[PDB]
Design an enzyme around this catalytic site. Sequence first.
Site, PDB file in Angstrom:
ATOM      1  N   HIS A 117       1.685   3.858   1.919  1.00  0.00           N
ATOM      2  CA  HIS A 117       2.063   4.561   3.147  1.00  0.00           C
ATOM      3  C   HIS A 117       3.583   4.445   3.281  1.00  0.00           C
ATOM      4  O   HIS A 117       4.192   3.524   2.729  1.00  0.00           O
ATOM      5  CB  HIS A 117       1.369   3.948   4.378  1.00  0.00           C
ATOM      6  CG  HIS A 117       0.009   4.513   4.649  1.00  0.00           C
ATOM      7  ND1 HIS A 117      -0.868   3.949   5.559  1.00  0.00           N
ATOM      8  CD2 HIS A 117      -0.634   5.591   4.138  1.00  0.00           C
ATOM      9  CE1 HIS A 117      -1.981   4.651   5.590  1.00  0.00           C
ATOM     10  NE2 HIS A 117      -1.868   5.657   4.736  1.00  0.00           N
ATOM     11  N   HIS A 163      -7.494  -0.994   5.895  1.00  0.00           N
ATOM     12  CA  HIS A 163      -6.547  -0.074   6.514  1.00  0.00           C
ATOM     13  C   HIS A 163      -6.404   1.141   5.587  1.00  0.00           C
ATOM     14  O   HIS A 163      -6.284   2.285   6.037  1.00  0.00           O
ATOM     15  CB  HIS A 163      -5.199  -0.769   6.697  1.00  0.00           C
ATOM     16  CG  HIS A 163      -4.088   0.163   7.052  1.00  0.00           C
ATOM     17  ND1 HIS A 163      -4.080   0.897   8.226  1.00  0.00           N
ATOM     18  CD2 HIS A 163      -2.980   0.525   6.378  1.00  0.00           C
ATOM     19  CE1 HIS A 163      -3.013   1.666   8.246  1.00  0.00           C
ATOM     20  NE2 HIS A 163      -2.322   1.465   7.140  1.00  0.00           N
ATOM     21  N   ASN A 220      -3.664   4.494  12.226  1.00  0.00           N
ATOM     22  CA  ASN A 220      -4.197   5.630  11.479  1.00  0.00           C
ATOM     23  C   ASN A 220      -5.446   5.198  10.709  1.00  0.00           C
ATOM     24  O   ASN A 220      -5.362   4.340   9.836  1.00  0.00           O
ATOM     25  CB  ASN A 220      -3.141   6.131  10.485  1.00  0.00           C
ATOM     26  CG  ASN A 220      -3.608   7.337   9.669  1.00  0.00           C
ATOM     27  OD1 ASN A 220      -4.776   7.440   9.285  1.00  0.00           O
ATOM     28  ND2 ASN A 220      -2.681   8.242   9.383  1.00  0.00           N
ATOM     29  N   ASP A 266       5.729   3.390   5.599  1.00  0.00           N
ATOM     30  CA  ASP A 266       6.324   2.130   6.042  1.00  0.00           C
ATOM     31  C   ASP A 266       6.358   1.048   4.959  1.00  0.00           C
ATOM     32  O   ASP A 266       7.006   0.013   5.129  1.00  0.00           O
ATOM     33  CB  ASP A 266       5.610   1.617   7.306  1.00  0.00           C
ATOM     34  CG  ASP A 266       4.158   1.229   7.058  1.00  0.00           C
ATOM     35  OD1 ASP A 266       3.458   1.941   6.308  1.00  0.00           O
ATOM     36  OD2 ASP A 266       3.708   0.217   7.638  1.00  0.00           O
ATOM     37  N   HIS A 289       0.825  -1.208   0.000  1.00  0.00           N
ATOM     38  CA  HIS A 289       0.000   0.000   0.000  1.00  0.00           C
ATOM     39  C   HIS A 289       0.860   1.259   0.000  1.00  0.00           C
ATOM     40  O   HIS A 289       2.065   1.192   0.238  1.00  0.00           O
ATOM     41  CB  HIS A 289      -1.044   0.017   1.134  1.00  0.00           C
ATOM     42  CG  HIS A 289      -0.485   0.220   2.501  1.00  0.00           C
ATOM     43  ND1 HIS A 289       0.229  -0.750   3.173  1.00  0.00           N
ATOM     44  CD2 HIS A 289      -0.598   1.259   3.366  1.00  0.00           C
ATOM     45  CE1 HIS A 289       0.524  -0.323   4.385  1.00  0.00           C
ATOM     46  NE2 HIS A 289       0.032   0.899   4.526  1.00  0.00           N
TER      47      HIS A 289
HETATM   48 ZN   LIG Z   1      -0.547   2.108   6.291  1.00  0.00          ZN
HETATM   49 ZN   LIG Z   2       0.458  -0.096   9.781  1.00  0.00          ZN
END
Ligand SMILES: [Zn+2]
Ligand SMILES: [Zn+2]
Length: 216
Positions: free
Chosen positions: A77, A138, A169, A79, A75
């Site tokens: 994000h 998520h 989040n 990280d 995804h």
């Molecule tokens: Zn994420």
């Molecule tokens: Zn996460």
Amino acid sequence: TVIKNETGTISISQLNKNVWVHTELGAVPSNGLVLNTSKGLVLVDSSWDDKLTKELIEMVEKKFQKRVTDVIITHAHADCIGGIKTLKERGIKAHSTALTAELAKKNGYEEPLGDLQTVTNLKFGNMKVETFYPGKGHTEDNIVVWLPQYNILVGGCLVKSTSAKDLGNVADAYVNEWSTSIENVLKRYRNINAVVPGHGEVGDKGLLLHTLDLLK
Ligand SMILES: [Zn+2]
Ligand SMILES: [Zn+2]
């Protein structure tokens, strides 16, 4: 077998013969996988930023004495896609769904390939990998990765660890649909052995049930 960098911000733990889990501290840990194949190394997710991503890559290439050829981005994000700039300059193919590719551009990150479909099967040497988009959770674009030869599921941030009582989040999350998406994963993979959460210790199918519990 566990390997760490002098600073302790990056570690790699062996799950089985050719499957390792990589964890980096941003402190906040984040998991991913390192697959040792006969044709190079394949990673599931990069790291928080370019510095850590480069370090991770240098660490695994040195250990296995091979090139990291591909990375699967679960995804958009930090990280997960934080080190996309490092990947592209090293000739590493950054696989992702088209949706992840466009959300990446939107978050100021360079763009991944956008090649993954809802169900995509990849084979690196003798290592089989299946990517699956279960629906929004998520994030709108989160996908899971399945290793059919080991029945190992990489849940990513769609799955919380056993000690986690917080979803994280949810500003970019689809809380209501998240449960349905986890159900799609449970219906698709009937015999799961190990489950790797986005953050935390590797567990089993109980982690998916635990996450569904948090979502109730
Ligand atoms: Zn994420
Ligand atoms: Zn996460």
